[PDB]
Amino acid sequence: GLMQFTLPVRLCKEIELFHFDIGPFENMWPGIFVYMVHRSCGTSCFELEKLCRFIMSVKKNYRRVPYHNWKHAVTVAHCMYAILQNNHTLFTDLERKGLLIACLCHDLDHRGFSNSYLQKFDHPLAALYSTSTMEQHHFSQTVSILQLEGHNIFSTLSSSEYEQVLEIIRKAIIATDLALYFGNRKQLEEMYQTGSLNLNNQSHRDRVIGLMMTACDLCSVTKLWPVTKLTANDIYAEFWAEGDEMKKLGIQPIPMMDRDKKDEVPQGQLGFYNAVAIPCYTTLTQILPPTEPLLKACRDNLSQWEKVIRGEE
Numbered sequence: 001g002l003m004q005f006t007l008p009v010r011l012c013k014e015i016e017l018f019h020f021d022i023g024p025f026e027n028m029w030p031g032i033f034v035y036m037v038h039r040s041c042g043t044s045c046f047e048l049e050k051l052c053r054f055i056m057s058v059k060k061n062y063r064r065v066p067y068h069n070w071k072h073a074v075t076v077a078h079c080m081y082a083i084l085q086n087n088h089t090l091f092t093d094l095e096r097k098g099l100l101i102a103c104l105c106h107d108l109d110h111r112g113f114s115n116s117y118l119q120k121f122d123h124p125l126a127a128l129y130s131t132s133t134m135e136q137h138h139f140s141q142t143v144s145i146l147q148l149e150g151h152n153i154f155s156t157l158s159s160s161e162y163e164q165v166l167e168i169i170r171k172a173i174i175a176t177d178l179a180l181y182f183g184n185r186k187q188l189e190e191m192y193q194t195g196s197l198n199l200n201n202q203s204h205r206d207r208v209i210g211l212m213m214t215a216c217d218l219c220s221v222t223k224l225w226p227v228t229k230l231t232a233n234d235i236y237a238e239f240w241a242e243g244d245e246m247k248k249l250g251i252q253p254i255p256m257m258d259r260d261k262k263d264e265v266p267q268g269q270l271g272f273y274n275a276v277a278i279p280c281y282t283t284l285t286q287i288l289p290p291t292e293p294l295l296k297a298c299r300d301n302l303s304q305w306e307k308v309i310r311g312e313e
């Protein structure tokens, strides 16, 4: 009850900033996550014994893949922490509780393959979930862990409150399907420009939370250039392996996933920042103005990619 979590001075200061990197020490990440939950939601919201057991089971169900791993989980959760800390008056206690958990669990059991690969392969998960295949599996995995003996971190909540927090987690995890982002951001853009956006309408809150999930999920493009540059090799390692599997199915992969087109990467990153990342952080800054450092850092990395093409690095 009086066992607060503390971080070394550099980490304690740096953790508040959007561009924070959690470092290479796996053992520190559960403590970093707990420190974030206590400052975001309170020392009281979770029973520490049940929380630690939940974290370790979540860790155990992340696989050893180059990008969609346990490190990504904590990175996404930190980004959500930074947003919640800079907009603390906007969210309910249940939302703060639910979103940090949703971020930690959003890629549970990811094997490094896209929904299209699962569909082309004819994987059993594609039969069970027609759309947002992986995302429905990720939420399904989250519910499984919560039902383990001594793992229910929402045990003190009422039946209706528990149903609400689980529904926030479900919608938030489903929102990490990038195919859904395009529509969501288009709809949110119009609501903001026509002044019809109201954060008291629950369906509008859902859409805003969905945008924050995409923003946190892509936050690797909003770090300092050395971090972003190195994390890009990790995502391409997954892309190229998926393309290799596409070729085994007798399908020519898209240039992005073809390891024989490694030279086309800087041009592909420009297309990504222009079509996906910049529009995402732009709309998010309009709806949540303290989230501007994300767009700032994203624009910086776009410029860095332009320098790469121009032979300046």
Ligand SMILES: Cc1ccc(Nc2cncnc2)c(C(=O)Nc2ccn(C(C)C)n2)n1
Pocket (backbone or CB within 6 Å): 178, 217, 218, 220, 221, 228, 229, 231, 232, 235, 256, 268, 269, 271, 272, 275
């Ligand atoms: C979903 C996702 C999350 C992160 C990503 N990149 C990343 C992460 N961390 C550091 N640097 C970069 C990417 C990504 O580059 N995807 C790409 C590449 C090409 N395209 C087309 C144009 C659509 N999309 N996608």
Ligand SMILES: [Mg+2]
Pocket (backbone or CB within 6 Å): 106, 107, 176, 177
């Ligand atoms: Mg995902």
Ligand SMILES: [Zn+2]
Pocket (backbone or CB within 6 Å): 072, 076, 106, 107, 176, 217
């Ligand atoms: Zn993710």
